[PDB]
C-alpha cells in the first residue's frame, strides 16, 4: 500500500499500488483507485489505504443508491463537501487495527482542480502551492524524490515520471508495496478522464524507466567528489 | 535521530545526527556516537537512538568503573559479547515512551571487523555480506540509496558518501533529523580511530556533495523518457 496524489497548475496526477493485507498469511492484489466521472461536468478520484474491510465498507456507503440531495460523491456541490462525505462515511463505519485513510481529488465544473487528504479520524486537509502533494500507506521511502522535483510549475509528464520513480524506490526497499500500479493523469478543465492505465510487471515503459533511472543514478553517484582524507 | 552503521571488506563506516527530543517543547543537540578505543588492540563504536534518559543511563552503566573481569566494553573478549553487554544494560535500565535502540561495531585484535543491531528488547543481530548495513531512528527516507549502492566490495570513500547522501535526503524530508552529524571511518586491521569528525551547517565538503548530487540527480531525471500514451 502506497498511494500518491499530486496537484499542479496544469492538472492532477494520481498513482496507487495493489499489494494489500487481506488477513493472516495472505497478502493479495486489490485495486486502490476509484473513479467517479460525469464526462463534461466532473471527475473525482479516490485512493484508499489501511484496513481493507474498512475501506471497502466506506466505498460501499458512498455508493449507496438511494441517498439524499447533494449527499453522493457525484452530486456534491464542491470538492470540499466531497471530502467531508468521505470523512463522515469513515466515521460511520468506525462506530460499527481497523484504521483507514484516503486521498480525494478532482475537478467540478467552474471550480479549479483540488486535492484533499482524509485522516483516520475523518477530518481532512487541502493541498496548496506550498504543499502540492499527499501520500498515504508506506510513504517515507518515496517522499524525497517528490520533495526534490514537484512544484506547481511541474508538467504533467514530469509529475507522472516522478510518481513512478517514487514507486520504484519504495518497491525496492519495502516488500509491503507491489505491482500492479494504477496511474491516472488529469488535464485541467478537461472534465474527462484523459489518461488512465494499469502498469504490470511486464510493462515495457516502466521497465525502461527503472533501468535508465538506475543507470543515471549510478553515474551521478560515481561523479561525486572524493573526500580530502 | 538517524544513525547508520556500514560494514565492508575494507572496514566500517558510522554516522549519526544530533537532533534529539529532550523533553516538552525542547529539541536540542546531543551527540549520539560514543567511542571506546585502546589504540593497537581494539576500537568499538556505539550509536544511540530513542529516549535520551534511557540511552544516557545505558551508557552510564557500561562505563561503571569497577565492573567484573570481561564485563566492560573495553575488556569484552569478542564483539558478540560486547553486544550482549549493551543488551543486558538496556534490560537492567528498563526494569527501573522510554524505548531505546543501538548500533554497535568495531574490531578486536585477531577477529575481523563486525557490526550489530541491538533491539529495544535487548536481543540483537549481526550484519552479513547480504545485509551489510543497519539503521536506527527515522530510517526509511535514507534506506533506498543505501540499498542501491552498498555492497561488501564498496570502498570506504563511497560508503561514506552514500551515508552522507542518505542523511541529505532524510533531512530534506523530515524535520526530526538535523545537523551536526558525526562521521567515523575505520580501516580494517588498523586498530585505531583513523578518521573521525563533526560535520556542521557550514561544512564545505558536505555542501559540495549535496550540490553535486542534486545537480546530477536532476540531469538523470530530465533525461528519462516521457510516458507514451
Numbering used by the authors:
A (entry chain A), B (entry chain C): 1 to 96, 107 to 239
Can you list sentences taken from the study reporting this PDB entry?
Also for Cons-Anbu, we did not observe well-defined particles in negative-stain EM, but could visualize elongated helices upon cysteine crosslinking (Cons-AnbuA53CN133C) as for Pa-Anbu.
We find that Anbu forms a dodecameric open-ring assembly that locally resembles the architecture of the self-compartmentalizing proteasome, but is not closed for steric reasons. The individual subunits are essentially all in the same conformation, assuming the same fold as the proteasomal β subunit.
